[PDB]
Amino acid sequence: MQIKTKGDLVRAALRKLGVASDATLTDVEPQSMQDAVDDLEAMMAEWYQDGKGIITGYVFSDDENPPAEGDDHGLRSSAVSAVFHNLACRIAPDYALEATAKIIATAKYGKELLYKQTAISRAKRAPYPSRMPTGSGNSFANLNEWHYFPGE
Amino acid sequence: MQIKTKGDLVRAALRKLGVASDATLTDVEPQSMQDAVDDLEAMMAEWYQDGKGIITGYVFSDDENPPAEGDDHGLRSSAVSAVFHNLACRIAPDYALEATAKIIATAKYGKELLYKQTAISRAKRAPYPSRMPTGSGNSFANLNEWHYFPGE
Amino acid sequence: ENRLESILSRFDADWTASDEARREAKNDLFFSRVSQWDDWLSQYTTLQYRGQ
Amino acid sequence: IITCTAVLKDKQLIAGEHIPIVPVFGEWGFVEDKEVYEGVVRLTKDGQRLRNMIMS
């Protein structure tokens, strides 16, 4: 993919919003880019609720490294579009703007697709209760005095 | 088909939006074309969820090859229309535009037709459960001590 | 000519003649004496409730 | 007396004019030169195996 850094995601979001692009004649101040990177970091931290939210492979930059822009986001190829669409939606209010309906629909669809695989992996059935017998059909379990399921 | 490259898809999408065409007097900057191919690629990666999404035969370009535009997309003849209609819908917000109702309807229909065959192929019935007997009618299985279905 | 060979030939013919009936009778004895869940070929796959 | 490889006792003559083994049969017959014997449990195996499954 050509989108390999956090700043690349920021530029993609700004191009989606029409605020700035590599084709326009006036591009935003680097402070605006830093603010957008901060918004992206905050959003990603909110999504990734310390491992109990949306898993994306995003790499959170440290304070020791000076430039937050320039580090690889670490996202997979299938996750970039959703991330930068949601970023455009989130940073639209900064410029007294409002993301168009297509951007909002794409952001919703991308977030759903982002969480689809994790939701599939988290649909785990609980084990048998501790008060449930194994049954006489399980000859191996019954010969070894395992009459009831362990549980937990 | 005359649409054999990613740039051909981008040009078709731009023509469908009325932004640029081989007949107009002003065509978009090549940077705009590069930005569109970066969205075709992001959209294609989002659709193709590492093989668990929409299968289309699209070939993802590598970084080593410099020009992302110029490589054959690898799509079938029946996927090109859907792909470039969805691309036009996705890149419309870049130019402060909104795709007309016909373009959105065609994109929906094309995506549905794109996933139709894969959905048919993925409607597979699960095997018999491990606790289900084969029955005495299955003489071959019963004679070979296969009184129960394997499962899994 | 060998006595062992003739005895074994007769025994093998008789054993192969009545294979199906013997198998069914042994299955009946196991079903009515040990357990109705005659699932020996595949039981060590996962643990599920099997009641008799 | 025989094993799979040798004969231990060869032709030990025993008393009687008949083989001393007495068999007892239930439902006995021949289908196609193939002896078949059945009791009461066979035909109930299919239904019971279902009743065990559903109840499980």
Write the layout of secondary structure elements.
The structure is cut from a larger assembly and holds 2 copies of chain A (152 residues) and 2 copies of chain C.
Chain A (H helix, E strand, L loop, with lengths): L5 H12 L12 H18 L32 H12 L9 H21 L17 H5 L9
Chain C lengths: L2 H15 L1 H15 L19
Pfam families (chains A, B): P22_Tail-4
GO molecular function (chains A, B): hydrolase activity
GO biological process, one term (chains A, B): symbiont entry into host cell via disruption of host cell wall peptidoglycan
Quick structural summary:
Chain D: Belongs to the p22likevirus portal protein family. Chain A is built from five helices and no strands.
- Please indicate the percent range of residues of chain C in DSSP E strands (runs of 2 or more): under 5%
How would you sum up the major sheet of chain C?
none
- Give the DSSP E fraction of chain A (strand runs of 2 or more residues): under 5%
Tally of alpha and pi helices of chain A: 5
**Tally of strands of chain A:** 0
Order of helices and strands of chain A: HHHHH
**Protein chain pair with the most extensive contact, residues per chain:** A-B, 29 and 28 residues
* Structural class based on helices, strands and sheet pairing of chain C: mainly alpha
**Fraction of residues in H or I helices of chain C:** 55-70%
